[PDB]
Every structure is written in C-alpha cells, then in structure tokens.
Amino acid sequence: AAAXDXSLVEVHXXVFIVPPXILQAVVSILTTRXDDXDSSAASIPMVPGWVLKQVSGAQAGSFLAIVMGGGDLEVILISLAGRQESSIXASRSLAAAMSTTAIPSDLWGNXAXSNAAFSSXEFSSXAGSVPLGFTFXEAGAKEXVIKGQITXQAXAFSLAXLXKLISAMXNAXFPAGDXXXSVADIXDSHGILXXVNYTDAXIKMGIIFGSGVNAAYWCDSTXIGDAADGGXXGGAGXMXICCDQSSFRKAFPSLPQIXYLXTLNXXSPXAXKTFXKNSXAKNXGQSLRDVLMXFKXXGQXHXXXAXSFXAANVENTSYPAKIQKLPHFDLRXXXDLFXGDQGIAXKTXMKXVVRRXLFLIAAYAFRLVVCXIXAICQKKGYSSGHIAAXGSXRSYSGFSXNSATXNXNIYGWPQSAXXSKPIXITPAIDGXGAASXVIXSIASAXXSXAXXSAXXA
Ligand SMILES: Cc1ccccc1C(=O)N[C@@H]1[C@@H](O)[C@H](O)[C@@H](CO)O[C@@H]1O
Structure with missing residues (x-):
C-alpha cells in the first residue's frame, strides 16, 4: 500500500520465501534420513506395509x-x-x-x-x-x-x-x-498407494496432504534392514513402506524454520513431527495470526481496532484459503471476514498485506510439502511416474499447481504445462476404503496359497 507498509511486506517475503536451493538442501538430507530409517535404526519410522506384491488390475x-x-x-x-x-x-x-x-x-x-x-x-x-x-x-x-x-x-x-x-x-x-x-x-497412506496402483500402473507413490502429511511407496526387501527374516519372499522384490515422514528433521539441521514456526512448535503438545508442522496446512491460519498480531504490536495495522483475534488457533485453515480465493480486488470477502468474525475493520491497504501474507504462507507449505516426494523418486530412481495425492489440502486454493511447479524447480524441468511434466501429481483413488479392500485381496491370497505375510516367527 504505503512505503512503511510495503517494507514490512517485503520482509515477510524474506521470511516465508523458500528458493529451490533451500528445497534442494532439504530434499537431500531427506534422501539420507529415508535411508537412515530403513537401516538398523533411524528417525523416520519407515515401517514396512507388508505389501509384498504389486497388483494387476x-x-x-x-x-x-x-x-x-x-x-x-x-x-x-x-x-x-x-x-x-x-x-x-x-x-x-x-x-x-x-x-x-x-x-x-x-x-x-x-x-x-x-x-x-x-x-x-x-x-x-x-x-x-x-x-x-x-x-x-x-x-x-x-x-x-x-x-x-x-x-x-x-x-x-x-x-x-x-x-x-x-x-x-x-x-x-x-x-x-x-x-x-x-x-x-x-x-491410510498405504491404502492410497495400493488402490491407486490397481487402477493406474504408473503410480509411484501414495501421499496424503491433510491435517497430517505422509507418503508411501514401494521399496524392495533387499534394500531394507529387515533382511534377516523372510524365505518365501522373492528374495528381493516388492515391499511397500509407510514412511510416516511427518517427523523428518526433528533434529533441525535443515528446515527453514522461521520464528513463527518455533512459536507454533512450543505451544504445541511440543517438540515433534516437525516436517508435518512445516508443511501441514492445518497450522496455516495460526501462522497467519502470528504475523498479523506481530504487526499490530509494532503498530502498523489494526490501529485502534479490538482483538478477539489474539486467541491461539482461532483461525483455522479456512481463513487464508478464503482470503486466497477472494476474487475481486478491493478484497471485499476478507473485509467481510475480519470484520464481524473478529469485529475488526481493516482498510484495503491492510487487506493487501493480509492477502499477500496468505499468499506466501500457502505457497511455502505447498513447496516444502513435495520435498519428500522428490526424495523418494530420487532415492528409488523414478525418473517419471504418477504421484497419487489425497488430503483436504487438495481442495485448498492453488495448492496443486504450487507443489507441481515446486517439483519443476527441484528437478529443473523446462516445460510449460503441468500435464507435460515427467512426474505428475494426480488425484488418488480412495486410500481409506478401496485401497484397504485391494490389500485384503492381496493378503487373503498370500494366506490362502500360504505364501507368508510378515517377518519369520
Ligand atoms: C503422530 C504419529 C506418531 C507416529 C506415527 C503416527 C502418527 C500420526 O498420526 N501420523 C499420521 C499418519 O499415520 C497419517 O498417514 C497422516 C495422513 O493421514 O497423518 C499423520 O501424519
């Protein structure tokens, strides 16, 4: 809006802007952490799904x-x-x-x-x-x-x-x-890899972008550390893993954890699931609330105005979502919202800051959020494939396009449209339901023809 304000806006652009170099750095220790967890020990659970078979359709x-x-x-x-x-x-x-x-x-x-x-x-x-x-x-x-x-x-x-x-x-x-x-x-993550693979042979991963975030993919039993129990297992072929990577970098050598993020950590039933905390959209309204409150205090906005806003997690995910979907210009929908919702009256210059802020905050959850997808493809060597995605965040303003091009960033693809990108994120088939039915059919047979369903007992 006005100079004092534009300044404050460019600095929030410094705080929430995450460049490929950062994304590349993160992805890189992600590969490693992944390995770590498949080894005899490691901080990412990387728990075998016990889905020893592909699936035919x-x-x-x-x-x-x-x-x-x-x-x-x-x-x-x-x-x-x-x-x-x-x-x-x-x-x-x-x-x-x-x-x-x-x-x-x-x-x-x-x-x-x-x-x-x-x-x-x-x-x-x-x-x-x-x-x-x-x-x-x-x-x-x-x-x-x-x-x-x-x-x-x-x-x-x-x-x-x-x-x-x-x-x-x-x-x-x-x-x-x-x-x-x-x-x-x-x-649920297993389920979506599976059900989604039964209908689309090109499926390389099953990921959830909801309150929590996680992914599943197929590794192979010989590249694991579970190798000590088997026999009937193809001796090196086909093991589905439940990453449960919403915990990556609880060590903190590499996520661009801002002061807002530290705060959110602290106030949480503390100190865990930090990859989830930094890419879960469940926390994006509270990250929005913190910067806002921070500018009020520094007396740049909400001059005069009363605050019922200073209530931890008052703003859910639907607040920046709605602010991002604001169609017209004078951001009539945000004003409506802040107003009687919080009973705040903002001018359009503020609304501009509120919107630009929602902008940053959305795009960075969307960018960081694909770092563990590209880590898998790299570690497992998938040069092309389909990533079947599920979660509430995919029915979040521009998230789909955001991660997509984040991916183009990490990898370097010079390609115009998404549809033309080597690895594409597409919608999954039902993880929780069908995926769980497709795994029973797989299971049941193994039992039937008694091939074996776990670690030697
Ligand atoms: C917090 C916790 C600790 C260790 C292992 C499991 C959990 C968890 O709920 N994690 C869940 C995970 O199981 C699920 O796939 C995703 C998507 O729905 O949501 C969270 O990330």
Missing part, C-alpha cells in the same frame, strides 16, 4: 473395508474386476461417549453390529465369507498384515487397555455374531 471379487476415526466408521463394500472397482458404503457415528469408555469391549462391539447391519443390508444371504481390510490410522506395530498393535491413541480416544493387537479384538466380536474375516490392518 485383474484382481476380482467382493471385499470389505473399514476405517474409523473420531466421529464415524465407514464401512465399504467394494467390487473388484480387471482394473476397475465399485464401492458402496455406509457410515456410522461413534456413539457419543466412545473414545472415553472404560470398557473396551464397547468399541469392537460397536463395529461388529454395524458390520452385521451392513451385511444384512447388502446380502441378506451370502455363502463363502468375505475378507476385510481395516485402515487403522493410529499406531504401528505390524509384524504382519494380519497384525496391528495400538502404539498410542490419536484422534482423541482413550480407552483403557488396548496397546494390544486390535485385530483379535474385533474378530472375536465377529464370530460371536458371525460372517467375515479380518485379513489386513493398514495405514
């Missing part, structure tokens, strides 16, 4: 899948057939009071009757008995696919006595009632 049949979080349980029935799939679903809301039940039988009892309900709805007969895939985004501890132990409750549950294998926990309540078999317990 020629796999057929009826498969069950569920995923539940706080709120709902999605039960999906999916119909598989020579590279296409038909899903049908239903959701059930967690009985208020579940999450904090004293009795564990309650949770499983819940998923078993919902299951009973869906089948009775869906079949009303049926003879064979169908495999089920449980996507349990919560805590590793898969020894095998058919496994799964709660490491720690996320999503805000707290149910006494579980850090057990959640699997035996649920089937039990099945027999009791009757009809299906839990053949695989998995992660």
Whole structure:
C-alpha cells in the first residue's frame, strides 16, 4: 500500500520465501534420513506395509473395508474386476461417549453390529465369507498384515487397555455374531498407494496432504534392514513402506524454520513431527495470526481496532484459503471476514498485506510439502511416474499447481504445462476404503496359497 507498509511486506517475503536451493538442501538430507530409517535404526519410522506384491488390475471379487476415526466408521463394500472397482458404503457415528469408555469391549462391539447391519443390508444371504481390510490410522506395530498393535491413541480416544493387537479384538466380536474375516490392518497412506496402483500402473507413490502429511511407496526387501527374516519372499522384490515422514528433521539441521514456526512448535503438545508442522496446512491460519498480531504490536495495522483475534488457533485453515480465493480486488470477502468474525475493520491497504501474507504462507507449505516426494523418486530412481495425492489440502486454493511447479524447480524441468511434466501429481483413488479392500485381496491370497505375510516367527 504505503512505503512503511510495503517494507514490512517485503520482509515477510524474506521470511516465508523458500528458493529451490533451500528445497534442494532439504530434499537431500531427506534422501539420507529415508535411508537412515530403513537401516538398523533411524528417525523416520519407515515401517514396512507388508505389501509384498504389486497388483494387476485383474484382481476380482467382493471385499470389505473399514476405517474409523473420531466421529464415524465407514464401512465399504467394494467390487473388484480387471482394473476397475465399485464401492458402496455406509457410515456410522461413534456413539457419543466412545473414545472415553472404560470398557473396551464397547468399541469392537460397536463395529461388529454395524458390520452385521451392513451385511444384512447388502446380502441378506451370502455363502463363502468375505475378507476385510481395516485402515487403522493410529499406531504401528505390524509384524504382519494380519497384525496391528495400538502404539498410542490419536484422534482423541482413550480407552483403557488396548496397546494390544486390535485385530483379535474385533474378530472375536465377529464370530460371536458371525460372517467375515479380518485379513489386513493398514495405514491410510498405504491404502492410497495400493488402490491407486490397481487402477493406474504408473503410480509411484501414495501421499496424503491433510491435517497430517505422509507418503508411501514401494521399496524392495533387499534394500531394507529387515533382511534377516523372510524365505518365501522373492528374495528381493516388492515391499511397500509407510514412511510416516511427518517427523523428518526433528533434529533441525535443515528446515527453514522461521520464528513463527518455533512459536507454533512450543505451544504445541511440543517438540515433534516437525516436517508435518512445516508443511501441514492445518497450522496455516495460526501462522497467519502470528504475523498479523506481530504487526499490530509494532503498530502498523489494526490501529485502534479490538482483538478477539489474539486467541491461539482461532483461525483455522479456512481463513487464508478464503482470503486466497477472494476474487475481486478491493478484497471485499476478507473485509467481510475480519470484520464481524473478529469485529475488526481493516482498510484495503491492510487487506493487501493480509492477502499477500496468505499468499506466501500457502505457497511455502505447498513447496516444502513435495520435498519428500522428490526424495523418494530420487532415492528409488523414478525418473517419471504418477504421484497419487489425497488430503483436504487438495481442495485448498492453488495448492496443486504450487507443489507441481515446486517439483519443476527441484528437478529443473523446462516445460510449460503441468500435464507435460515427467512426474505428475494426480488425484488418488480412495486410500481409506478401496485401497484397504485391494490389500485384503492381496493378503487373503498370500494366506490362502500360504505364501507368508510378515517377518519369520
Ligand atoms: C503422530 C504419529 C506418531 C507416529 C506415527 C503416527 C502418527 C500420526 O498420526 N501420523 C499420521 C499418519 O499415520 C497419517 O498417514 C497422516 C495422513 O493421514 O497423518 C499423520 O501424519
């Protein structure tokens, strides 16, 4: 707007501007950290998915899948057939009071009757008995696919006595009632690599850009450190990994962690998942709020104005999103927002700063966010491929285009349009649902023809 203001704006341009050189530096220690975690030790979990097989698109049949979080349980029935799939679903809301039940039988009892309900709805007969895939985004501890132990409750549950294998926990309540078999317990990122690969052979990774961020890809058993248990395993071929890289650089030798980012760390149930904190859009409204508050204090904006704004995480992700989507010019939509929302009255020169700031903040989450994608392709040597992306942040103003060209940056591609880029980020197929059904079909057979599903016991 005015000189004093433009100055302050260019310095925020210095703070949130992240050049390829930085991105290249980050990507480089990312390769290494990746390696680190596949080795006998390392800070990125890099937990094997136990998906030992590619997948054809020629796999057929009826498969069950569920995923539940706080709120709902999605039960999906999916119909598989020579590279296409038909899903049908239903959701059930967690009985208020579940999450904090004293009795564990309650949770499983819940998923078993919902299951009973869906089948009775869906079949009303049926003879064979169908495999089920449980996507349990919560805590590793898969020894095998058919496994799964709660490491720690996320999503805000707290149910006494579980850090057990959640699997035996649920089937039990099945027999009791009757009809299906839990053949695989998995992660949402795995699911999207898999289901997405069944429909598109060119898929090289499965990534989520939502509240949390993570990715999955296929490594190969001989390039791992798990090599000490196997036998029936092709002796060097096809192992899916759940990176759980939202923790990269908790050591901090290389993310361009600004003062705003330190603060966000601190105020968080502290000091972890720093790659997530620096590229998760879940925190982008709070990063926006901090600079804003910082300029108020230095008396450059919101002169006079009252603050109900100085409330940690008052601004969610939808605030910069909306400010970025502001179509016209005098940024009429932001003024509306700040106003009665916060009851602030800003002039258009401020709105200009608020917008330019949302701008920086979005683009850098989008840029940093692909550093672990290009790290995989490099480490695994994928010169071309498709990255199947899922997450809420992909229905965030210009995120798709941003990471895309961030990638063109890191690599150096001189290409006009995205569609022409060697590695393209495309939308995934359903990770949580179908991906979990496609992994059961894979699983089940391995069991069937008993080929082996985990580390030698
Ligand atoms: C915080 C924590 C600690 C270690 C291992 C798992 C977690 C986690 O929830 N991480 C989840 C991850 O499992 C999931 O794939 C993504 C995308 O949905 O969201 C977070 O990153």
